[PDB]
DNA sequence: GCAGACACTA
DNA sequence: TAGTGTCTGCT
DNA sequence: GCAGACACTACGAGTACATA
DNA sequence: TTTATGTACTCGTAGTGTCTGC
């Protein structure tokens, strides 16, 4: 059935190492479009969305849509056994109890064929829905990650204010402050180091420390991330994938 | 070095639920569960050697022989059981997706579960509550009082009783025809008397008789293994004359190489389990026997202490 | 007419078969012992014909079966109310003489229609799930075109809604009223509660015996109101660190699935459901104090489910939450539910058997369903013949509490000739070993507060008390030997006998007062504290005093009272300097002054003397020292 | 054992 | 709103 | 090459049990 | 709760080593 030949293993390893920290049991859905995975953590506060297109696979082949719900601890343990130049290849049989993933080396001697048992995760339908967001600001993912880490040096107090049409991060905490004012991220020299805000009357929002701390751990996939804010809708931090997309839904604390 | 033949205990272990003898009602219930397949969580308890874990293994084998290797997790006291090494493994096994026949479920056999930590049982409570649709549990312990109350609530209690002489005799004759060994009825009754309901003890004693003498008679059986010391202690405590008890003690325990502490503990157990005499007499005997036990434990272990204990037993029995 | 037949029976003023369900609508109370059937066996035959067997004698009681000897309260109650009395000889002819259905008596007719109503409601709900089963099967067939009957009975027959629960209706409604009015208390800043008083309590608590439905009730109340259930348990760690890193951020955050599940007004909130609070087996590394901090500060409804509340481990939960107590439900609701289950499962059990099944299992409904599922595999007829074997095979050996252990141990029946055969010595040893850490203390506390019934001929009560005290002292010696450097823990059964079984077997009978908790723990703590203070003041006055701590209390301390309190009494504040001069001489502080006064007993108690001293006189003494 | 509260019935 | 039947904590 | 970044073993503190 | 060793368990922390990266 499923024969999803990746070109190599680094991107998949980065994806798993990114979203493995928050959720513990993801449910992959196999479709001709690609790989769809929606995961909710144990606190029911953060949601993880995976969309990987058929372009991101070398030779992808799916006959029937099969549900492959696997653990992330065991998947990480298996994927720590893989090199970088090897070609990861996900294989699933008919009505698969276990998913077979194998690495092919360019040395042409080494075939490491690990079979991973599949868990029985409850069948949850696609709860995703198109929503309009009040604030939509984007910056390079490394810059956002380091700024969020500086904000999270303090306990839980994060504040974003858009007064005077300029973005300031005046954060507080239990002892000390994290009021790191960021300059307007505009640079014609580097197109990736750019900023873009959709105003729609923004005021402020406060998140949790571990929430964005786990959001920023997936920074390896995309150069820049579009941070989205909505008043009555779950938040969105969508990373850009060459063949799909990766967004982390979140509910802002009240 | 020469290899060893398989012991008769494990060579003739039953593989189906029809070969196991003893509690007919419990085995019939197990066979009806076998036919239906919807096996509930069960706790199996009894004194050692009456067919507890072999019945669980036979039930699992007949339920899913093709998947015994895949969907049966046999954790036990030899394996490391704790809070995390149990919760992680059992949760992974219970959430594991394995395709059974419609009436079959994965079986988690917790053999020797009376030694488990209470927090492990607390986690097991929610494990069984959540994943009862896919996996089923099967405890097997000697003492069922160690298992916490909620687990016994969320389980089907199956109590095993010690086998009567008829069932042990039937199994002994079956194994004798299978092994083709000569025997005498007196030797077989001696083996049954020595076993005291334990089938494994009966098999061990029969094999020892066969391999040491060849003919299963009373003389050979009593040569290899002695009469149980609880019985000799019971008849020592119940004797009429003090001289009779003194000589029984000396000859049958002191000259047979029995430790004084063992004799005192056996006397305590017999007097606790003794029935013909009055309750207050047993309480007084236990009090003075415990005084003697304290004397033995402090270091004074001699024949004189046991003789004095017997003298006090008789001074209590003759009513001053 | 049952009443007409009962009048024809010759009463007393000091066994054959019968028609099925012939004692219907008849109340039976058993007192004394019967020559043919013992109390348990006669009660089985009393319930064999649908007769309610109450445990207490009443004015509305119809007939009482009289034996030989029982509690004096029953003997005085029967005589004054002139209740009908029939001996065991009349019981045998009662079975044959009474026709089926209990006749047309007023009590019998009322019992039958209630029993028919119980069967009627059983049949009404029997096809409710059957119609539902046909509904889901048709829906499942359509989905397949465009697993059941292999499930645990405790799961498929789970309460669909709050109306399907059995018992604890008041507790369930209390929880529902607390949950539905949590937002109202949130608006009022948890200051003033309502008539029930649940408004001030931010979080509710559920505690009760296993199998009665705490988890199901909490989940159903959460689901009905539309809340999102956030549940934790013992399967995952709940120590301080991951509690701070887990649900701590969920106190004021909503469901990400809550937005995507939507009219619902409570669909985007959390109801924290911590089942098995007893699994936090940690005094410091455990999360019990952390959960207390959540009870202090939480912006969302929170619910706890445990089994026993009174453990010292769970002490910080004393006055924290709306304590909702569940209990063993009465046999009628379980009777109706089991009738529904039996109708739906095509196996039949007699309706009177359900009472014995509940009595055997001690009000554990889930274990009752497990018993039914296990028995129904091969034994399809649960009736009068199999009930005894089923009960003695599935009896639940629940460990007893210390008070129940003391009450059971000081009974004169179990040390009688007939009583001890049923309750052997090993049973008493196990009864001790249930709570061996507390049992000797509970025996010693109230072994002389009971009226003995096992007195030997010519032996007074005081002699039995003396023998019991001697054996308690011997058991104390054995206990000291056990808990010492040698650690002779193989000697435990001897201590069991000497400290609980022998002392009780001499003074057993009926308690004159009530089962009292041991006073040795509190007095021991007080003595340890007083020893600590004695050491502190002794080493404060160590210089210049050639006397140890024992001689300080016996000799020195009575003299200090008449140098440090009598000037306050005979001349008041005029001797403020002299008292301070003596107090400063022995390096005594102000704290030591109050400590010395509490060491006195009898006629030298200074608590009243200091109280009578005017506050103006005492105020100056403190200020001058400072 | 001594209350003490929760029900069913009156 | 008031009699029983029965489960439950007393430290 | 050097400084983190990680997962790993090891040590220490605390709780609980000790006859069927 | 006291109880006085020894065992077993659980957790938390501190070092200890190795792998990524620049
Ligand atoms: N009822 C029985 N029928 C046949 N063989 C039996 C029976 N009971 C015990 N045996 C034999 O006893 C041996 C081992 O018995 P087990 O069932 O392993 O003992 P057990 O019941 O597990 O007791 P413990 O508590 O585990 S020591 C095997 O050789 C079995 O064949
Ligand atoms: N009041 C009740 N009425 C009907 N069925 C019940 C009732 N209480 C329990 N049950 C049955 O028992 C099953 C499990 O009950 P639970 O609510 O899990 O017991 P519990 O109160 O949680 O006790 P624990 O948590 O095991 S100590 C349910 O699915 C029902 O089948
Ligand atoms: Mg075994
Ligand atoms: Mg529960």
XYZ file of N, CA and C in Angstrom, chain B residues 287, chain C residues 410 415 440 443-450 452 454-456 459-476 495-508:
144
model
N 0.293 -18.936 73.953
C 1.026 -18.003 74.806
C 2.332 -18.616 75.308
N -14.102 -7.499 70.151
C -14.748 -7.570 71.462
C -16.231 -7.918 71.313
N -16.199 -16.059 70.598
C -15.439 -16.860 71.546
C -16.291 -17.922 72.225
N -3.510 -3.447 68.587
C -3.300 -3.546 70.044
C -3.675 -2.285 70.801
N -7.429 -2.261 71.120
C -7.861 -3.235 72.117
C -7.618 -2.696 73.522
N -6.436 -2.121 73.758
C -6.103 -1.624 75.088
C -6.949 -0.419 75.478
N -7.395 0.372 74.499
C -8.166 1.570 74.817
C -9.504 1.229 75.460
N -10.210 0.236 74.929
C -11.583 -0.033 75.341
C -11.815 -1.516 75.588
N -10.913 -2.166 76.323
C -11.162 -3.534 76.754
C -11.812 -3.607 78.128
N -11.746 -2.534 78.911
C -12.404 -2.476 80.207
C -13.665 -1.626 80.189
N -14.085 -1.147 79.022
C -15.295 -0.350 78.886
C -16.475 -1.161 78.373
N -16.356 -2.483 78.338
C -17.386 -3.360 77.805
C -17.890 -4.312 78.882
N -18.763 -7.854 79.996
C -18.347 -9.167 79.496
C -19.488 -10.171 79.452
N -18.282 -13.521 78.363
C -17.496 -14.747 78.300
C -16.871 -15.003 79.663
N -17.505 -14.487 80.714
C -16.980 -14.644 82.062
C -17.043 -16.101 82.504
N -15.952 -16.572 83.099
C -15.911 -17.915 83.645
C -16.782 -17.996 84.896
N -15.851 -16.074 88.149
C -14.877 -15.049 87.798
C -15.588 -13.711 87.649
N -15.148 -12.719 88.417
C -15.711 -11.385 88.322
C -15.119 -10.641 87.127
N -15.715 -9.488 86.820
C -15.254 -8.690 85.689
C -13.846 -8.158 85.925
N -13.539 -7.778 87.168
C -12.231 -7.211 87.477
C -11.119 -8.237 87.297
N -11.389 -9.505 87.617
C -10.389 -10.549 87.406
C -10.083 -10.729 85.924
N -11.122 -10.720 85.084
C -10.914 -10.812 83.643
C -10.138 -9.610 83.122
N -10.442 -8.417 83.638
C -9.708 -7.222 83.229
C -8.244 -7.326 83.642
N -7.982 -7.864 84.835
C -6.605 -8.037 85.289
C -5.844 -9.014 84.401
N -6.477 -10.134 84.041
C -5.833 -11.091 83.142
C -5.558 -10.469 81.777
N -6.530 -9.723 81.246
C -6.343 -9.060 79.961
C -5.206 -8.051 80.023
N -5.116 -7.292 81.116
C -4.043 -6.313 81.262
C -2.681 -6.989 81.368
N -2.611 -8.115 82.082
C -1.359 -8.862 82.165
C -0.914 -9.339 80.788
N -1.852 -9.866 79.999
C -1.494 -10.320 78.660
C -1.162 -9.154 77.737
N -1.782 -7.992 77.952
C -1.420 -6.801 77.191
C 0.009 -6.378 77.507
N 0.405 -6.453 78.780
C 1.785 -6.142 79.148
C 2.768 -7.127 78.517
N 2.426 -8.418 78.524
C 3.284 -9.406 77.871
C 3.396 -9.141 76.372
N 2.276 -8.805 75.729
C 2.316 -8.431 74.328
C 3.141 -7.186 74.080
N 3.124 -6.243 75.022
C 3.973 -5.063 74.912
C 5.449 -5.436 74.955
N 2.747 -11.746 69.054
C 2.279 -10.433 69.479
C 0.809 -10.247 69.145
N 0.383 -10.748 67.983
C -1.023 -10.697 67.601
C -1.896 -11.332 68.667
N -1.577 -12.574 69.030
C -2.332 -13.276 70.064
C -2.298 -12.485 71.366
N -1.092 -12.270 71.904
C -0.934 -11.734 73.253
C -1.513 -10.334 73.402
N -1.546 -9.544 72.330
C -1.998 -8.168 72.442
C -3.421 -7.947 71.955
N -3.998 -8.870 71.188
C -5.362 -8.581 70.771
C -6.337 -9.718 71.025
N -5.915 -10.970 70.868
C -6.868 -12.075 70.873
C -7.113 -12.588 72.282
N -6.042 -12.870 73.022
C -6.201 -13.287 74.411
C -6.820 -12.208 75.298
N -6.391 -10.933 75.265
C -7.075 -9.929 76.102
C -8.549 -9.768 75.777
N -8.924 -9.874 74.501
C -10.322 -9.719 74.124
C -11.150 -10.948 74.468
N -10.557 -12.141 74.406
C -11.294 -13.363 74.702
C -11.678 -13.483 76.169
N -11.126 -12.639 77.038
C -11.469 -12.646 78.454
C -12.560 -11.648 78.811
N -12.705 -10.572 78.039
C -13.621 -9.488 78.362
C -14.612 -9.227 77.228
N -14.761 -10.170 76.302
C -15.642 -9.958 75.165
C -17.103 -9.924 75.605
